[PDB]
């Protein structure tokens, strides 16, 4: 319930630090800004003007303390802190054409773009340079949202091809082998392990669970679809009376929260018993708007707690407001909400 008015224009990407001490964001500009928190008021500390266009994706490796960013500049920048100045390194994306996220291994990052090729990229210490191998198998459209599993070897991504596929970007030269998952045994770089059955709506949202058992995604057909490999890769969809969702993340192992064009963060729970998804309701209950943000949500990351028991949810939207939510206050407010 803590919205902070930072800018008037929309927001592109929302990133956080290791100890969540600093927050990084871009305001649809050729530069990216990094602000910290000193008291009740927030103040900007760093500014990076390396990119040559509107910044689309940005993710910060917590343990590595190193933030990579890639947008319309058709290039990637693996920025690392050098003394009192964040030095950027141009990691060649090798794409003729909107998403980026570090792995749990924090050693290689996936850059999903409009080149219809999930461009995985690892850092070669032998040549002191970043290399980006491109996984393009069974990919027909851009990669809207990309999220890893706990394995740090299998990536998930939604496409404009009306489907959310879970492929493998595992480079066997940057890590050890991958253990057998319930999503399959054969895990190879480029091998399609999973896919969606939808033929309508764009998969703007996609996120995997903490246990790595279930992978959920949000489609732009006013429908959300969560799949569980625990029940032979069963797919469970649900149509929301509200508008389409833009970002999707799981709070618990059976409770996920998501927002979008509805401009209001919503909560939902899926019963493993019956094998179907259910709607929890509106967690954001109160210009002329009936919600905090005056536009659609654009991103929703986790502040602290994990995907099994999030204690604080961070929400960035097209309203220019930083929405800081707490599960405790939300549960203390809506007594009819079962998590």
């Amino acid at each position: 319930m803590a919205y902070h008015s930072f800018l008037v224009e929309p927001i592109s990407c929302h990133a956080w630090n290791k100890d969540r001490t600093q927050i990084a964001i871009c305001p649809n500009n050729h530069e990216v800004h990094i602000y910290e928190k000193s008291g009740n008021k927030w103040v900007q500390v760093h500014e990076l003007k390396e990119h040559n266009g509107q910044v689309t994706g940005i993710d910060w490796a917590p343990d590595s303390n190193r933030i990579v960013t890639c947008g319309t500049d058709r290039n990637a920048y693996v920025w690392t802190l050098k003394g009192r100045t964040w030095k950027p390194t141009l990691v060649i994306l090798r794409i003729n054409r909107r998403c980026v996220r570090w792995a749990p291994n924090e050693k290689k990052f996936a850059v999903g773009s409009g080149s219809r090729v999930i461009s995985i990229c690892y850092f070669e210490q032998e040549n002191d340079w970043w290399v980006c191998k491109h996984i393009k198998k069974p990919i027909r459209s851009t990669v809207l949202s990309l999220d890893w599993h706990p394995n740090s070897v299998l990536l998930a991504a939604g496409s404009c091809d009306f489907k959310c596929r879970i492929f493998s970007a595992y480079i066997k030269e940057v890590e050890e082998r991958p253990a057998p998952t319930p999503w399959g045994s054969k895990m190879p770089f480029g091998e399609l392990m999973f896919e969606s059955s939808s033929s309508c709506g764009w998969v703007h949202g996609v996120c995997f669970s903490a246990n790595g058992s279930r992978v959920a995604w949000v489609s732009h057909d006013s429908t959300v679809c969560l799949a569980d490999a625990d029940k032979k890769m069963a797919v469970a969809t649900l149509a929301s009376e509200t508008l389409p969702l833009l970002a999707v993340t799981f709070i618990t192992e059976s409770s996920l929260v998501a927002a979008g064009h509805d401009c209001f963060p919503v909560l939902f729970t899926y019963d493993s018993a019956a094998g179907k998804l259910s709607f929890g309701g509106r967690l954001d209950v109160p210009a002329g708007l009936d919600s905090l943000h005056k536009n659609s949500v654009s991103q929703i990351s986790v502040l602290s707690g994990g995907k099994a028991k999030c204690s604080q949810f961070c929400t960035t939207g097209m309203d220019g407001g930083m929405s800081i939510w707490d599960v405790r206050s939300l549960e203390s407010a809506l007594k009819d909400l079962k998590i």
């Binding site: 057909d221 149509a239 508008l243």
Partner: protein, 116 residues
């Protein structure tokens, strides 16, 4: 396409609920023939047109979500051919459908790749 007789029987019976519920069965969305889609659209249009104003709420409330989406899409297809003052009834039906399925129905109608 759908079956004409199954609807004609309920139409002769006066039970509009059965006819409306049967008209949306096996919609020709996957079909490539525009004739089948035109037939289904005209059929649904005929079904909705004969309906009385005050009784529409019950029949509209009797339908399901998927049926609401199919009805919205079929109504959109029927909206491209406004004739015999069917536009007013289609408008009232659009209001009822909007109140029933919300913005999600029309959103599903626009995001659809294969429809009537």
């Amino acid at each position: 396409g759908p079956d004409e007789g199954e609807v004609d029987s309920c139409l002769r019976q006066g039970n509009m609920t059965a006819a409306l519920q049967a008209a949306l069965k096996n919609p020709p969305i996957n079909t490539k023939s525009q004739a089948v889609k035109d037939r289904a659209g005209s059929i649904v249009l005929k079904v909705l047109i004969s309906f009385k104003a005050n009784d529409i709420e019950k029949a509209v409330q009797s339908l399901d979500k998927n049926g609401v989406d199919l009805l919205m899409k079929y109504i959109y297809k029927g909206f491209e051919s406004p004739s015999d003052n069917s536009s007013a009834v289609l408008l009232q039906w659009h209001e009822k459908a909007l109140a029933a399925g919300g913005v999600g129905s029309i959103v599903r109608v626009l995001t659809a790749r294969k429809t009537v």
